[PDB]
Amino acid sequence: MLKKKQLTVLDLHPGAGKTRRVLPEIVREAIKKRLRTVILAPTRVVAAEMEEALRGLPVRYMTTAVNVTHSGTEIVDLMCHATFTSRLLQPIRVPNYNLNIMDEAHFTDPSSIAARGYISTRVEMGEAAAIFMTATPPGTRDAFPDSNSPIMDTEVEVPERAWSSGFDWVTDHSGKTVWFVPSVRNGNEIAACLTKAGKRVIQLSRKTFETEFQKTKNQEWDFVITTDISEMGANFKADRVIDSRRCLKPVILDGERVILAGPMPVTHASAAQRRGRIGRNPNKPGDEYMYGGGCAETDEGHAHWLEARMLLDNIYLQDGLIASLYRPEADKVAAIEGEFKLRTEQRKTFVELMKRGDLPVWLAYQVASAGITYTDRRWCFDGTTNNTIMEDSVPAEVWTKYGEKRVLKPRWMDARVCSDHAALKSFKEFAAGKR
Ligand SMILES: O=C1NC(=O)[C@]2(CCCNC2)N1
Predict the structure, then answer these.
(1) Within 13 Å, how many C-alpha atoms sit on residue 152's CB side?
(2) Which of 72, 179, 181, 310 has its C-alpha lying 20 to 30 A from 264's C-alpha?
């Protein structure tokens, strides 16, 4: 696999040992052949699990998730998918790695799609080798793959709201359950219902992932209520997965706004990864997987593929050449390579709105392409009245950096900035000029 001009997909079934058995062996061969290598982890939690599998090998951990003393003798670098894409965007010179390893290469976040595009382009050019590690490569139609031990698969109606009757099987369980919900607000309702019934619940989501995941190892729990973030390598000591088979889909309407569409069916890749959390112990057969819907190809027209094109159009590759998306996922968006290329100063603003502003890619691009500077927040209040952000069914208000109380009404409306309480509080802070 380590021969240049070669991209290998390592598609062993979930729990076959890609991370703990195959990855250390690849690292050893790369160090023997003096290949400057990058290892890309989807989350800080997977990076910490990788340090355990790679302990004793000279790897440089470019993450704050691991507390190791780097000697300077390392030719292998380990960083998160988002860190790699960020460093490509920023004016930091990233080495041109001879070997690129992506763990959980199925991740559909824009920074992961961009990383796959950049890497696969470098391989197509004959400049580098790559390895994509995932049980569910882009374009999988099988949601029931192999596992370490047999899983009991059951199609059943799954509640997506609080309940009093009709779902006795949910609370009649004596083990540990991982429940995938389409959104944070949906998770809150189900968690409140389980807690009222005397159950110990941990909730997980993108923003609180590292902190709450530690609670899954540190204390006894009955249920874990999570969003799709737990599809990226998160390991649990569970015996059942309850799967709504639903997700939210960010959609760009008329090229003017972003809505969160659905809940709608997940892809086969997500269903296989959610099911993949159980049946991982060969000595314990009979783990259950209860699913409450079918799969569909909801990644076509999904805003993340357009956002990944916005990122690759602003990453330098070679003169005016721009990286293409990784071929099996390239038709998920109708986009021309280069259409989102920004001039030097607008590009710098685009990077800063994402890095410091913490805004979604699409929204950061609308602001930067309009020729607005990072600290100028007048666009958060001058949008049409239909763009009024609402808090508790009344218009949201913020004190501007001028000491004037104004209704939050952005020129470009992106539902992700107000999808939950934490997202709205963070966007109010940005509109206030607090970061
Ligand atoms: O909202 C805006 N702030 C600004 O400085 C501009 C002025 C006119 C066009 N360039 C950007 N717009």
Answers:
(1) 10
(2) 310
Tally of CB atoms within 10 A around 184: 22
Please tell me what DSSP assigns to residue 136. S
- At 218, give phi and psi (nearest 5°): -90, -15
**What is the distance in A from the centroid of ligand 1 to the CA of 372?**
5
Structure tokens at 107: 């991740």
Q: What is the CATH number of domain 7-133?
A: 3.40.50.300
Number of neighbours of residue 275 by Cβ within 10 angstroms: 23
Resolution for this PDB entry, in angstroms: 1.8
Ligand 1 centroid, distance to 373 Cα (angstroms): 8
Closest by Cα among 264, 299, 303, 267 to 415: 303
CA-376 nearest atom, ligand 1: 3
Neighbouring residues of 321: CB distance < 8 A, sequence distance ≥ 6: none
Widest pairwise Cα distance in the chain: 64
- Measured from the Cα of 378, ligand 1's closest atom is 1
108 CB-side CA count, 13 A? 31
Ligand 1 centroid to Cα of residue 211, in Å, is 40
Radius of gyration for the chain, computed over Cα atoms and rounded to the nearest angstrom: 22
Inter-residue long-range contacts of 204-207, CB under 8 Å, 24+ positions, other chains counted? 204/229, 204/230, 204/234, 205/229, 205/420, 207/422
Shortest-distance atom of ligand 1 to CA 379: 1
Right CATH for 151-291 from 3.30.420.10, 3.40.50.2300, 3.40.50.300, 2.10.110.10: 3.40.50.300
Q: What is the CB < 6 Å shell around ligand 1?
A: 370-372, 376, 378-379
Could you tell me if residue 34 is left (phi over 0), alpha (psi between -120 and 50 degrees) or otherwise beta?
left
Residues 6+ apart with CB under 8 A from 110: 304, 307, 308, 310, 311, 361
Mutate to test the pocket of ligand 1, among 346, 376, 380, 381 (most ligand atoms within 8 A of CB): 376
To the nearest 10°, the Cα dihedral for 350, 356, 359, 362?
Answer: 20
Contacts of 139 (CB under 8 A, 6+ apart): 328, 329
According to the entry, how was the structure determined? X-ray
Q: Return the residue whose CA atom lies nearest to atom 4 of ligand 1.
A: 372
Three-class SS state of 11: coil
